[PDB]
Amino acid sequence: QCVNLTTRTQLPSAYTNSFTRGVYYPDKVFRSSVLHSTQDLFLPFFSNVTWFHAIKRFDNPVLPFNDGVYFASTEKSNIIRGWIFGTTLDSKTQSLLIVNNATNAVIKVCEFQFCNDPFLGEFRVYSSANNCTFEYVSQPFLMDLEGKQGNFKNLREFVFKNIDGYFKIYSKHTPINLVRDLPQGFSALEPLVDLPIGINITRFQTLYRSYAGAAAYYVGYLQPRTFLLKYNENGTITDAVDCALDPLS
Amino acid sequence: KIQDSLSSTPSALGKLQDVVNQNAQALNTLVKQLSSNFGAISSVLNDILSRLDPPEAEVQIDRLITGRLQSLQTYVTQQLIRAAEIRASANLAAIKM
Amino acid sequence: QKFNGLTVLPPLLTDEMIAQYTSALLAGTIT
Amino acid sequence: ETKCTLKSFTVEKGIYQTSNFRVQPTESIVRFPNITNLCPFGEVFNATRFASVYAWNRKRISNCVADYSVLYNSASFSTFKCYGVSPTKLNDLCFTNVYADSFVIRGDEVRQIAPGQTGKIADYNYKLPDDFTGCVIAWNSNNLDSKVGGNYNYLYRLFRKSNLKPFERDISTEIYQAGNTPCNGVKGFNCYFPLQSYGFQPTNGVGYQPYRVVVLSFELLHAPATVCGPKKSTNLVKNKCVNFNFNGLTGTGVLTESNKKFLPFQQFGRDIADTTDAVRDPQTLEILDITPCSFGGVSVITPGTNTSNQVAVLYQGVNCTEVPVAIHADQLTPTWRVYSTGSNVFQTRAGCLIGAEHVNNSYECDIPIGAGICASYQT
Amino acid sequence: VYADSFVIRGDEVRQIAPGQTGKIADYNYKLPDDFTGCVIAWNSNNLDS
Ligand SMILES: *[C@@H]1O[C@H](CO)[C@@H](O[C@@H]2O[C@H](CO)[C@@H](O[C@H]3O[C@H](CO)[C@@H](O)[C@H](O)[C@@H]3O)[C@H](O)[C@H]2NC(C)=O)[C@H](O)[C@H]1NC(C)=O
Ligand SMILES: *[C@@H]1O[C@H](CO)[C@@H](O[C@@H]2O[C@H](CO)[C@@H](O[C@H]3O[C@H](CO)[C@@H](O)[C@H](O)[C@@H]3O)[C@H](O)[C@H]2NC(C)=O)[C@H](O)[C@H]1NC(C)=O
Ligand SMILES: *[C@@H]1O[C@H](CO)[C@@H](O[C@@H]2O[C@H](CO)[C@@H](O[C@H]3O[C@H](CO)[C@@H](O)[C@H](O)[C@@H]3O)[C@H](O)[C@H]2NC(C)=O)[C@H](O)[C@H]1NC(C)=O
Ligand SMILES: *[C@@H]1O[C@H](CO)[C@@H](O[C@@H]2O[C@H](CO)[C@@H](O)[C@H](O)[C@H]2NC(C)=O)[C@H](O)[C@H]1NC(C)=O
Ligand SMILES: *[C@@H]1O[C@H](CO)[C@@H](O[C@@H]2O[C@H](CO)[C@@H](O)[C@H](O)[C@H]2NC(C)=O)[C@H](O)[C@H]1NC(C)=O
Ligand SMILES: *[C@@H]1O[C@H](CO)[C@@H](O[C@@H]2O[C@H](CO)[C@@H](O)[C@H](O)[C@H]2NC(C)=O)[C@H](O)[C@H]1NC(C)=O
Numbered sequence: 158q159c160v161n162l163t164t165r166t167q168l169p170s171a172y173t174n175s176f177t178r179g180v181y182y183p184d185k186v187f188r189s190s191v192l193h194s195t196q197d198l199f200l201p202f203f204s205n206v207t208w209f210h211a212i213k214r215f216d217n218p219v220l221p222f223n224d225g226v227y228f229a230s231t232e233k234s235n236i237i238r239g240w241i242f243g244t245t246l247d248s249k250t251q252s253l254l255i256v257n258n259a260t261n262a263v264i265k266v267c268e269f270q271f272c273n274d275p276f277l278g279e280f281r282v283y284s285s286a287n288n289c290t291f292e293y294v295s296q297p298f299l300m301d302l303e304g305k306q307g308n309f310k311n312l313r314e315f316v317f318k319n320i321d322g323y324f325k326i327y328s329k330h331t332p333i334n335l336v337r338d339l340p341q342g343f344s345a346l347e348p349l350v351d352l353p354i355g356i357n358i359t360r361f362q363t364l365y366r367s368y369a370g371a372a373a374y375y376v377g378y379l380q381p382r383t384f385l386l387k388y389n390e391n392g393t394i395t396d397a398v399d400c401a402l403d404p405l406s
Numbered sequence: 407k408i409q410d411s412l413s414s415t416p417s418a419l420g421k422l423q424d425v426v427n428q429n430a431q432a433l434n435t436l437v438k439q440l441s442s443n444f445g446a447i448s449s450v451l452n453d454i455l456s457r458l459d460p461p462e463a464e465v466q467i468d469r470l471i472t473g474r475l476q477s478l479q480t481y482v483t484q485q486l487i488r489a490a491e492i493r494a495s496a497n498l499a500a501i502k503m
Numbered sequence: 504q505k506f507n508g509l510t511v512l513p514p515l516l517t518d519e520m521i522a523q524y525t526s527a528l529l530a531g532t533i534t
Numbered sequence: 535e536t537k538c539t540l541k542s543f544t545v546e547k548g549i550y551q552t553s554n555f556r557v558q559p560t561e562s563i564v565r566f567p568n569i570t571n572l573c574p575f576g577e578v579f580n581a582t583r584f585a586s587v588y589a590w591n592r593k594r595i596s597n598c599v600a601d602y603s604v605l606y607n608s609a610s611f612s613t614f615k616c617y618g619v620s621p622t623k624l625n626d627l628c629f630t631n632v633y634a635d636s637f638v639i640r641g642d643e644v645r646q647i648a649p650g651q652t653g654k655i656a657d658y659n660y661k662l663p664d665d666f667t668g669c670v671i672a673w674n675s676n677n678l679d680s681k682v683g684g685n686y687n688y689l690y691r692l693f694r695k696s697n698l699k700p701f702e703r704d705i706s707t708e709i710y711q712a713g714n715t716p717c718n719g720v721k722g723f724n725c726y727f728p729l730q731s732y733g734f735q736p737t738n739g740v741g742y743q744p745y746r747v748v749v750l751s752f753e754l755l756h757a758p759a760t761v762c763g764p765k766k767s768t769n770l771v772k773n774k775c776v777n778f779n780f781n782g783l784t785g786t787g788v789l790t791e792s793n794k795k796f797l798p799f800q801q802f803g804r805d806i807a808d809t810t811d812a813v814r815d816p817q818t819l820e821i822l823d824i825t826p827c828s829f830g831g832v833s834v835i836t837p838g839t840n841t842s843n844q845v846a847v848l849y850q851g852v853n854c855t856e857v858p859v860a861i862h863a864d865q866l867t868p869t870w871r872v873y874s875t876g877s878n879v880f881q882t883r884a885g886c887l888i889g890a891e892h893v894n895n896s897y898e899c900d901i902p903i904g905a906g907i908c909a910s911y912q913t
Numbered sequence: 914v915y916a917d918s919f920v921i922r923g924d925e926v927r928q929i930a931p932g933q934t935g936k937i938a939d940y941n942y943k944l945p946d947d948f949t950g951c952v953i954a955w956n957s958n959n960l961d962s
């Protein structure tokens with residue numbers, strides 16, 4: 158099933174500043190009261206991250222993964238549903254699929270024939286699933302956070318890396334109460350799962366299953382750099398400073 | 407006045423604070439040096455012992471032995487130089503006394 | 504530090520005895 | 535000890551350092567996860583038909599118990615070269631994730647399977663990473679996969695614009711424009727199909743024969759490993775320094791109830807020296823700390839050798855409530871132990887002095903010990 | 914000069930080197946870790962088959 162609707166609905170693409178976001182737990186090691194430094198792919202702070210907002214009707218744009226992509230979500234009622242992965246997206250080359258449908262999240266990597274305008278309401282994301290090499294099912298990932306009834310908005314930061322054939326996912330939940338901008342503060346990400354894709358992916362798109370709600374995201378471009386992490390005495394990240402933002406850093 | 411001045415600023419006792427800090431920093435780096443690979447496949451001897459058969463295990467240990475021995479020599483030489491300056495200051499203090 | 508074989512040793516002259524030296528010196532001077 | 539250290543048969547009056555003292559471990563403790571089902575390594579090694587080298591299959595194996603001895607002892611394998619791993623300690627050591635990569639190649643390209651080499655399949659459809667760890671297993675299978683008319687289901691990728699990433703798998707069949715002019719359709723002049731077909735027949739000689747290969751891509755000990763061999767678990771004991779074993783973490787030290795809170799993806803706690811400092815039991819979800827049990831230096835206090843041969847002993851930095859536990863039942867680095875007889879014992883800030891008598895008369899410091907205490911050989 | 918003579922398979926020749934692992938090596942014939950000397954080997958099928 159596919160219906161191709163209208164156009165890209167103008168250009169709401171703007172810019173916003175990423176104050177202190179874009180860091181995940183680098184490794185599966187517990188450390189305390191140590192200012193550890195890691196040299197790997199992370200989002201720099203104050204990065205001129207691309208901004209979008211679902212102010213109606215809207216579409217999902219196609220963006221690269223040069224040295225991978227940091228993704229963040231400012232969401233309510235869990236509009237976010239996953240992402241689209243691929244390099245050619247025309248079933249000539251293998252592209253990966255993630256959809257968090259009503260039952261649970263399912264991840265499937267095949268030579269999918271992605272539709273020109275994938276939207277949900279309906280599972281209209283692809284027309285063909287010809288040749289497959291991976292298929293996985295689990296329990297749904299829509300873990301709504303504490304407080305309930307959406308008193309504070311949900312921040313669900315995300316990192317998706319493709320290193321030497323390994324696809325890594327990290328996750329975090331935290332409530333936010335800033336109306337439009339990035340909440341001032343620090344956070345990190347819990348690693349979730351490593352995925353064996355081994356396929357060349359250059360560009361992504363998003364899902365946004367459709368239904369009186371609004372939500373916006375950021376795009377951060379992950380880059381290989383050095384960052385200093387301030388672990389507390391409990392083993393959770395409490396502050397961070399760039400090694401390559403300004404002379405003071 | 408002297409008691410008041412000594413009770414006020416901390417920049418006066420830098421001479422002794424540095425004597426403490428240099429030793430602390432050097433020994434701290436000496437500890438840190440145990441985490442490096444020195445060209446091996448692991449920084450933990452137990453792992454290199456547990457993995458591999460007896461012959462190759464020792465070969466990787468040698469790389470580790472050479473690196474750690476070099477680190478020890480560097481630390482000892484720096485300590486020897488530091489001790490000489492501490493003794494030069496001690497002779498000056500004795501003459502002043 | 505101590506767990507890897509890095510051990511610190513105590514000085515021979517304790518601080519109380521060093522204080523005894525300095526007190527004796529200045530008392531002898533002033534008297 | 536003093537004479538042997540001085541490498542001479544006369545010893546002058548003074549305090550002499552000798553070999554360090556360290557408490558030896560008493561018993562062995564091994565703690566592996568108590569999963570029981572066997573890993574279906576037969577389902578990969580004896581699988582009916584593998585995929586082509588251009589489309590090599592990847593299977594994940596977990597939640598089971600393996601046995602690599604039956605693989606190393608099998609003479610069928612022609613080449614068995616391992617990287618940072620040995621089959622001897624495989625039924626012991628643990629594994630984060632076990633992934634079986636299965637494919638078929640020609641005998642000449644077997645050398646290309648190792649990381650770092652190059653070739654028509656190495657640079658095009660299967661390359662191992664620069665820092666690859668694992669072990670590759672290969673052996674001829676002509677009698678298993680060859681047909682008199684020719685086996686044509688096996689193909690490899692011949693032309694690509696740029697070399698692939700590690701473990702990359704390219705399935706696209708785009709026609710390669712070997713010529714400068716663009717082309718389309720099924721084929722064209724100087725426009726080859728990217729895949730090239732093999733001609734395996736029983737008449738071929740060695741080197742050109744098909745070699746069935748199976749590879750593992752495991753990673754070790756930087757994650758909460760889940761699979762390892764049939765090594766059986768024992769019980770744990772506390773407050774005694776022993777050579778424990780948690781999921782292949784060989785070590786030695788006294789284990790005590792810790793208080794740190796590992797995240798579910800965290801299994802190990804590391805110190806400044808990048809050494810493990812706390813451990814979680816792979817059978818119950820509590821967390822324990824590891825400390826190296828008591829050790830220290832030994833110094834021997836003696837007067838002039840010609841004057842006498844009686845000596846005392848001092849342990850630097852050792853609280854001598856331990857040395858009663860340092861009974862000569864288990865192993866100890868210093869063999870001599872008769873001096874712990876007792877009532878000739880005294881405690882200093884510098885350690886515990888054993889074999890000397892404490893008095894109140896003060897004298898000039900003859901032999902300096904530490905913290906203001908001085909010993910002397912006197913009537 | 915001590916001459917140790919014995920016959921094995923073609924594929925198990927690799928085990929004759931010191932420090933090697935295999936059935937023959939582990940069960941009946943291992944050379945010392947610091948072995949000095951050397952082995953001489955050749956096929957003898959047309960003599961002992
Ligand atoms: C969300 O996506 C899921 C995967 O994309 C999808 O899972 C699908 O579940 C159905 C029913 O469980 C499966 O259909 C088969 O179910 C059993 C499995 O043994 C068979 O006996 C049946 O005869 C039937 O063939 C689908 O196979 C499975 N999808 C895939 C790709 O395997 C969920 O249903 C989706 N949820 C919603 C609400 O759309
Ligand atoms: C590290 O985690 C610790 C446990 O989660 C946490 O300790 C907790 O600290 C709070 C406040 O610091 C305590 O709450 C009580 O604190 C004092 C008593 O010390 C009372 O006057 C307060 O009114 C309040 O009742 C918790 O009792 C305490 N819990 C535990 C188990 O220690 C630390 O604060 C955390 N440290 C960091 C740097 O994040
Ligand atoms: C993963 O997919 C990428 C996208 O296809 C691919 O990058 C592409 O590489 C080809 C060949 O290297 C380029 O083709 C052009 O190459 C040179 C420039 O170096 C031109 O002069 C030629 O005329 C030719 O048109 C593509 O331009 C390039 N595309 C992009 C978006 O980068 C990667 O190489 C793939 N990764 C691997 C490991 O194969
Ligand atoms: C997706 O949108 C495209 C618009 O580019 C639609 O393509 C046209 O489809 C009609 C048939 O309904 C053809 O007559 C046109 O020639 C097509 N245009 C082009 C440029 O190919 C397409 O129909 C839409 N998808 C679906 C499922 O309707
Ligand atoms: C990808 O899918 C295509 C479509 O089915 C496969 O092409 C078929 O392959 C079979 C088996 O070789 C042939 O019998 C068919 O004739 C092919 N279809 C066509 C239209 O030619 C292809 O094999 C698949 N590729 C992989 C790697 O699985
Ligand atoms: C040497 O060790 C003993 C015991 O191992 C220490 O004695 C402890 O002293 C504290 C404080 O006086 C008491 O709370 C403990 O109960 C004592 N232990 C026992 C087993 O009774 C002794 O203090 C240590 N020496 C030094 C210099 O610290």
Ligand SMILES: *[C@@H]1O[C@H](CO)[C@@H](O)[C@H](O)[C@H]1NC(C)=O
Pocket residue numbers: 172174205
């Ligand atoms: C971000 O980029 C936009 C245009 O790309 C520019 O207008 C804006 O000033 C930039 N902001 C920062 C903080 O660099």
Ligand SMILES: *[C@@H]1O[C@H](CO)[C@@H](O)[C@H](O)[C@H]1NC(C)=O
Pocket residue numbers: 575576579580604
């Ligand atoms: C494959 O089968 C043979 C006999 O059928 C058996 O000896 C061998 O052990 C099997 N492979 C594995 C990995 O067990």
Ligand SMILES: *[C@@H]1O[C@H](CO)[C@@H](O)[C@H](O)[C@H]1NC(C)=O
Pocket residue numbers: 567568569816817
């Ligand atoms: C190990 O055994 C205990 C009791 O025998 C059981 O409670 C536990 O679940 C077992 N471990 C696992 C990982 O299932």
Ligand SMILES: *[C@@H]1O[C@H](CO)[C@@H](O)[C@H](O)[C@H]1NC(C)=O
Pocket residue numbers: 840841
């Ligand atoms: C030790 O005593 C002997 C006599 O018993 C004497 O010959 C020797 O010189 C003495 N050693 C020293 C160093 O004085």
Ligand SMILES: *[C@@H]1O[C@H](CO)[C@@H](O)[C@H](O)[C@H]1NC(C)=O
Pocket residue numbers: 892893894
């Ligand atoms: C030294 O004198 C004290 C009295 O203050 C006494 O308790 C102690 O036993 C004396 N020392 C010895 C070795 O008897």
